[PDB]
Design a protein around this nucleic acid. Sequence first.
RNA 1: UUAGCUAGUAGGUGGGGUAACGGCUCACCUAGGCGACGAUCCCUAGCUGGUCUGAGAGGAUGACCAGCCACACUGGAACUGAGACACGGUCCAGACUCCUACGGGAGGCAGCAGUGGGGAAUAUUGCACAAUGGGCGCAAGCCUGAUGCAGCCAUGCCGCGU
RNA 2: UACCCGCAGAAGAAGCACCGGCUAACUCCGUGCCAGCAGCCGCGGUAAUACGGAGGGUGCAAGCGUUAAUCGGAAUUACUGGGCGUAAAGCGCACGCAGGCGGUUUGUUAAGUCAGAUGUGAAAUCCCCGGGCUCAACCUGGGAACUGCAUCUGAUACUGGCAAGCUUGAGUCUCGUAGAGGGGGGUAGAAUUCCAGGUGUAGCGGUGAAAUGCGUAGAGAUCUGGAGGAAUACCGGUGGCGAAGGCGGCCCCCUGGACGAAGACUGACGCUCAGGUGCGAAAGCGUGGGGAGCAAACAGGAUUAGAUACCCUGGUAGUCCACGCCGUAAACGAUGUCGACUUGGAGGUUGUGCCCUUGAGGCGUGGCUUCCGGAGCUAACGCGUUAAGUCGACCGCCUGGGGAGUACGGCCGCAAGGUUAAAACUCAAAUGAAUUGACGGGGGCCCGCACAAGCGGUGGAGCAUGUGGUUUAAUUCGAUGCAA
RNA 3: GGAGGGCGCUUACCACUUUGUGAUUCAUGACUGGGGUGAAGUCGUAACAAGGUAACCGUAGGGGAACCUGCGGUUGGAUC
Lengths: 123, 281
Amino acid sequence: ATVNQLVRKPRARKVAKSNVPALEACPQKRGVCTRVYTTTPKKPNSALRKVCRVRLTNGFEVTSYIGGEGHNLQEHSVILIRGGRVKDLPGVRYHTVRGALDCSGVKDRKQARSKYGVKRPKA
Amino acid sequence: MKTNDNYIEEVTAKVLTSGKYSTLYPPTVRRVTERLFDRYPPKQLEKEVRKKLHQAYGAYIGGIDGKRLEKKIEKIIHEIPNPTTDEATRTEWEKEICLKILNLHTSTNERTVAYDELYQKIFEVTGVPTSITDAGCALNPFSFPFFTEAGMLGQYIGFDLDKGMIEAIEHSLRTLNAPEGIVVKQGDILSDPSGESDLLLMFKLYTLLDRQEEASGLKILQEWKYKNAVISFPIKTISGRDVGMEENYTVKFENDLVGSDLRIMQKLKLGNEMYFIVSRL
RNA sequence: UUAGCUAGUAGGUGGGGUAACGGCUCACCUAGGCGACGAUCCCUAGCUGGUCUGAGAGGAUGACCAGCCACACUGGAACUGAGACACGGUCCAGACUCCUACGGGAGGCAGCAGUGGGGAAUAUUGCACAAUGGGCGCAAGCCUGAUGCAGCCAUGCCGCGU
RNA sequence: UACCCGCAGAAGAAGCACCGGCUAACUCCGUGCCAGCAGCCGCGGUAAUACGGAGGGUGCAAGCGUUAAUCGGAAUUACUGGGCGUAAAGCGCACGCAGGCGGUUUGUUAAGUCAGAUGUGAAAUCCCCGGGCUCAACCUGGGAACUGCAUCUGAUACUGGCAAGCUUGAGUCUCGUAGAGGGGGGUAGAAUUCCAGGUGUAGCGGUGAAAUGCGUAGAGAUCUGGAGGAAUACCGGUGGCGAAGGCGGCCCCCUGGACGAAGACUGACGCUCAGGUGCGAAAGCGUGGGGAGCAAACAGGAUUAGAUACCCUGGUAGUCCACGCCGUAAACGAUGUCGACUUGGAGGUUGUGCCCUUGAGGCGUGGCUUCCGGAGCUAACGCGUUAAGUCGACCGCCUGGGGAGUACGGCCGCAAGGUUAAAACUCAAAUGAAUUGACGGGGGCCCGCACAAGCGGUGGAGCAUGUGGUUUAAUUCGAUGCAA
RNA sequence: GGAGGGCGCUUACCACUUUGUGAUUCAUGACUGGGGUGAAGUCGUAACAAGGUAACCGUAGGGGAACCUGCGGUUGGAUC
Ligand SMILES: [Mg+2]
Ligand SMILES: [Mg+2]
Ligand SMILES: [Mg+2]
Ligand SMILES: [Mg+2]
Ligand SMILES: [Mg+2]
Ligand SMILES: [Mg+2]
Ligand SMILES: [Mg+2]
Ligand SMILES: [Mg+2]
Ligand SMILES: [Mg+2]
Ligand SMILES: [Mg+2]
Ligand SMILES: [Mg+2]
Ligand SMILES: [Mg+2]
Ligand SMILES: [Mg+2]
Ligand SMILES: [Mg+2]
Ligand SMILES: [Mg+2]
Ligand SMILES: [Mg+2]
Ligand SMILES: [Mg+2]
Ligand SMILES: [Mg+2]
Ligand SMILES: [Mg+2]
Ligand SMILES: [Mg+2]
Ligand SMILES: [Mg+2]
Ligand SMILES: [Mg+2]
Ligand SMILES: [Mg+2]
Ligand SMILES: [Mg+2]
Ligand SMILES: [Mg+2]
Ligand SMILES: [Mg+2]
Ligand SMILES: [Mg+2]
Ligand SMILES: [Mg+2]
Ligand SMILES: [Mg+2]
Ligand SMILES: [Mg+2]
Ligand SMILES: [Mg+2]
Ligand SMILES: [Mg+2]
Ligand SMILES: [Mg+2]
Ligand SMILES: [Mg+2]
Ligand SMILES: [Mg+2]
Ligand SMILES: [Mg+2]
Ligand SMILES: [Mg+2]
Ligand SMILES: [Mg+2]
Ligand SMILES: [Mg+2]
Ligand SMILES: [Mg+2]
Ligand SMILES: [Mg+2]
Ligand SMILES: [Mg+2]
Ligand SMILES: [Mg+2]
Ligand SMILES: [Mg+2]
Ligand SMILES: [Mg+2]
Ligand SMILES: [Mg+2]
Ligand SMILES: [Mg+2]
Ligand SMILES: [Mg+2]
């Protein structure tokens, strides 16, 4: 635009929309799951992911992701949901921590023990 | 109340007047607009009823080409002589003279593979209905030779909607000398399933009534107070291709069939059509 | 993707009110006022001295220290007083929490601790008026969850040790 | 309690992330598109430096990862500091108010601008110079800064206001020329078809085969004549005219724009723009006419286990005309307008002069239009004295590809719809230009029985247990175009 | 005794209400639309690389499905 076209209409910047629909100025969010089922990831991949729906407390039903070689969750239990970015699962944009609250973690693990709540064995 | 009530015929005549969409009975369309009054925006009533004429309920628009059917009837009935050495010899000639007329579209044609084995295997569970009805009689009105091969002689009256096809097949009463103990009349069943009969032949019903609404099939059988029926569907699964996209005319039955007076009697799956036998208390 | 808004709203005189200038509050007279240099309305947000990012121009933010304004269960209104339409004053209406011999009354942690609930998350029902500051008193003295400290969590910065 | 002193005693005190390319830093095993990480590109089918585990190394440390918010990165919101031919980007094209902006000479004023001084911009913090808790963090003195605003006192290059002038941009007018510029009447010819005579009768129209239509109540074809309607062949070249759209017969009236040319007068009445107004092909609509052809729906005949795609035979709207509404295109020159600067040559059209127009041309001075090309500009193709080059004034649109030029809310309509103009979700792209090559229901170039031809064969419903059909007294077995 | 004060009495504005009547707004929603992605139709073919193939723009009529026809427009153009 020319200099005269800037004193009437300012530069309207973007809304800075993040990759998450809502966050309530909160990094993590606690929810409760309803049903446990498995879906199909994408056309190239060929794996079975834990695509489970977890209903939050603000009235939003967003589907997260549960990673691990086997979790032991119950239909009526609290589930903490954090942030994450996954492309192989369309419609999914959240993860799920383990080893905290009513969710257990994996055992007999040494490398990458800072996540999934794994504990240090006494060697 | 012209906003909604003088704005039903402005919509309805237009379909039933145009020679391209005129393949319908006035009552059939009188119904399908009071149903769809509150369905699409008040400036888009006739406009999106054309969606039910193309995306849905189509090919019946333009119709089945009766001016191609008689073109293959007058070119058919005047091919071989009429060996009618007696009165049932007018039927055996009328048998093949009729057979090919149900074989232009590949639907009642996949039915002509069942003219000797599955037109009597159905009488062992309903009797021999002398009060009979039929839904979707597009090209299935010459089943009488085989229906009466067993001894069905009661009123068989199939109801189609394409009038350019019903009148290209109703003239046959005397032109083809079809039996004189049978009537036919127009009518739909996504709109009009009211009456009482004994056998309810459902040939081209398929899931076109379950296309008018999501999961609304168990309604019609009951509306026509009844006893039994016969309901078939295509099974043209191409070596594991049409699986799922063609195996639903069933799983919507057994599942939904717990709770009311409806039950099931028998079930088969041969040729290209899987017939259903139904019961009520 | 809110286009006109406004009849005590604009202006003169007189009267009246306030510690003071004023349609703040009236009568009369007049037909003007504001507005694409963005009037009104809706939504949202405290502002400033700063901090954070960046070499700057900018953008974002308004926590702690500090200036100023507004609020004191939810509304409205008034008195005492030099300064307030009053946070631990009072009267009254409504809601909620209690007591009572059914005539009925009292009270406010958006103060420091602490409890229940919501939330991925933030403390001990502590010590002392020694210093500082404020109110009262001639002085002494007393009051002062403001301040000065301790305890708790590695939240951050910095240093040291294993 | 800080600090200080003494005794015993290496005793109680180091984890975590990463370990494909970004981005420094690897071996094997288990598992085999199965079980699993995750920021991007992605990895995972008996050899994983991308999973898990062991070992090793690196980053870093009382902290290492992940997640959330802002900024830098991001020139991915460009006043500092980018584009608009083809990538997502100039409105179909103009006249113009409120705005922005406006040459030359002189003078005044001193708003803007510039300089000096005063007042003020509270403390911490940021900044600079030092000191003090053992040091640092923290804290602190002094100085500077707070880019701002206001008053007083000056200068007068530019800008702005007022007054007074000039001409280099040129308005207008006199004297001329060129044009389908636009509109209202009238006139002529050819052709199709209809309506009337004479003459001539089983064929005519039409599709590679067939048929429908049209004919013995005078068809088709031909001559003459008449009625009605529409379009202007050769002349006709990317020529001319207009802002764009658009408009080609001679031709009357009314009337506009542009350009040439020797001389006067008036002295920037100048450029551009939101809203608004006006124009805007074709198609479509409302109120009235015309209606011979052609031609969207509709229907006769073909055709095929379905052509409302194409072929053939007819026709209602529409095309034409008077009066209105809607304002939609590849409305493209994918290029807004105006002004100024800038190596040149070669083809048309249209004015005014010189020269021997005696060789119907050279040599000068303008408008419009086409092509090539250097410097320069741009990714590339190209543009390249009509700018998309080099400067300046004004405005509009576009901030990834789909959803979507949509829905909703206003405006514009008797309708069909248009204009202004989103939020979610999905995806790691999308789109452009130049290459290298495959390929094409391959032709201009091209070599060979490349198909033949000229002395002659193989090809035998027998068989040579090598053998092109039935075979388990075939199968304990090979190899399937002297290109497997 | 008066002045005047105070209580009562009463008029003014005025919160809480209360009956009708609109605007904006808000949360679910009874009746729902189309998109959307998972899916998935051994379709070039009703025209078997011969039953002899431009792409698009605006608009109208036919839109079982991308289309196809009328009118005008453009180059941004299968064998050619
Ligand atoms: Mg006054
Ligand atoms: Mg920067
Ligand atoms: Mg800095
Ligand atoms: Mg800054
Ligand atoms: Mg606070
Ligand atoms: Mg007082
Ligand atoms: Mg209190
Ligand atoms: Mg409270
Ligand atoms: Mg809780
Ligand atoms: Mg003191
Ligand atoms: Mg403390
Ligand atoms: Mg890892
Ligand atoms: Mg990696
Ligand atoms: Mg590993
Ligand atoms: Mg930036
Ligand atoms: Mg090109
Ligand atoms: Mg426009
Ligand atoms: Mg102007
Ligand atoms: Mg000045
Ligand atoms: Mg100054
Ligand atoms: Mg020091
Ligand atoms: Mg300092
Ligand atoms: Mg200082
Ligand atoms: Mg001076
Ligand atoms: Mg000016
Ligand atoms: Mg001046
Ligand atoms: Mg002047
Ligand atoms: Mg003319
Ligand atoms: Mg004649
Ligand atoms: Mg004759
Ligand atoms: Mg003639
Ligand atoms: Mg005529
Ligand atoms: Mg002179
Ligand atoms: Mg003069
Ligand atoms: Mg202009
Ligand atoms: Mg037209
Ligand atoms: Mg028009
Ligand atoms: Mg018309
Ligand atoms: Mg054009
Ligand atoms: Mg354009
Ligand atoms: Mg021109
Ligand atoms: Mg060139
Ligand atoms: Mg360019
Ligand atoms: Mg986008
Ligand atoms: Mg997007
Ligand atoms: Mg050679
Ligand atoms: Mg073998
Ligand atoms: Mg394009």
